[PDB]
Nucleic acid binder design. Structure first.
Ligand SMILES: [Mn+2]
Length: 178
DNA sequence: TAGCAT
């Protein structure tokens, strides 16, 4: 029974917490033990949903948050109807305005470190990468940041708030260093 | 699978 687990459950809304729990269990893993992975998955979900709220109403197909089988089904429907390349790893959103998949990532390292790791470990060229840090930096493919500044700014604000909440509980050093 | 580790 870790502090980190009880922190996560009062920091994120129940719908995000339930989707996180399902994602770790769908891959046979324990929120109670892998508490840093629990917090990261909740963080990734919250950013993806905040990001999809930033568009015009029909702009994005949400992939993140669905059962894996249904996620790939929706990816195949997009690739078959748009002709866009089928990504190798499950993306987070599909941008109907710019006709591309987006993979969002959140990092406690310098933004470019995770960006470059993603820009290889995913290879599948045409997928747009958008990285956010817990210090208010972002980095996106071709410096194309997809949303208005206000929509990205509220994401950066929320991430710094998660950081301060973890730090005020002495969970940040453990989280940052794991 | 998240993303930090290696
Ligand atoms: Mn992602």
């Amino acid at each position: 029974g870790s502090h980190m687990e009880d922190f996560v459950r009062q920091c994120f809304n129940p719908m995000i917490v339930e989707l996180a729990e399902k994602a770790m269990k769908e891959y046979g893993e324990d929120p109670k033990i892998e508490t840093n992975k629990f917090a990261a998955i909740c963080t990734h979900l919250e950013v993806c949903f905040m990001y999809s709220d930033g568009g015009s109403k029909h702009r994005f197909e949400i992939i993140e948050g669905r059962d894996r089988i249904m996620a790939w089904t929706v990816v195949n429907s997009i690739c078959n109807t748009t002709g866009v390349e089928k990504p190798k790893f499950l993306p987070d959103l599909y941008d109907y305005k710019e006709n591309r998949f987006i993979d969002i990532g959140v990092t406690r390292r310098e933004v470019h470190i995770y960006y470059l790791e993603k820009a290889n470990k995913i290879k599948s060229e045409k997928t747009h990468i958008h990285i956010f840090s817990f210090t208010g930096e972002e980095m996106a493919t071709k410096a194309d940041y997809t949303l208005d500044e206000e929509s990205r700014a509220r994401i950066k604000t929320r991430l710094f708030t998660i950081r301060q909440e973890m730090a005020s509980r002495s969970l940040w050093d453990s989280f940052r260093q794991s």
